Amino acid sequence: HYVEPKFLNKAFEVALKVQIIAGFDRGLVKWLRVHGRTLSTVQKKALYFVNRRYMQTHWANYMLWINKKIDALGRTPVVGDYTRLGAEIGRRIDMAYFYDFLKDKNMIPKYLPYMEEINRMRPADVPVKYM
């Protein structure tokens, strides 16, 4: 049996997704400390979904940046490198600018079954596509 190669080691992909989602979520918690009493339970879940889907649709953009950092290391990369880079993305995207738009313009998405499915996944399992 042939083995289909992966385009990024699974553990490396997992470190990126865990750290990006964790960082986006940390900023959502700080934003909800201020605004959470003005949002319904389903609206708050929709914003958690927004975090995961934002990572998914910006994945290829992040990979371009990650790969330049990896090429600059001067050695074989290891999982810790992807943890550090995913945490940097997780902290630097100022998602509250988007939360403010969604709240202030009454644009928080209607919460749907597929969104709850994505929220209930482990970050490690959230699907990404390489392009």
Describe what is shown at a glance.
It contains 5 helices and no strands.
Order of helices and strands: HHHHH
Do you know the CATH topology?
Answer: Lysin
Please tally the helical runs, counting DSSP H or I stretches of 4 or more residues: 5
Shape: globular
Considering the protein shown, what is the CATH homologous superfamily? Fertilization protein
CATH C-level: Mainly Alpha
Calculate Rg over CA atoms. Answer: 16 Å
Number of domains: 1
Structure write-up:
By secondary structure, this protein is mostly helical. The chain has a single domain, classed as Up-down Bundle (Lysin). The protein is 67% helix and 0% strand. It has helices at 10-35, 41-71, 79-92, 96-104, 113-120. Helix 2 crosses helix 5 (113-120). It is globular. The two termini are 26 Å apart.
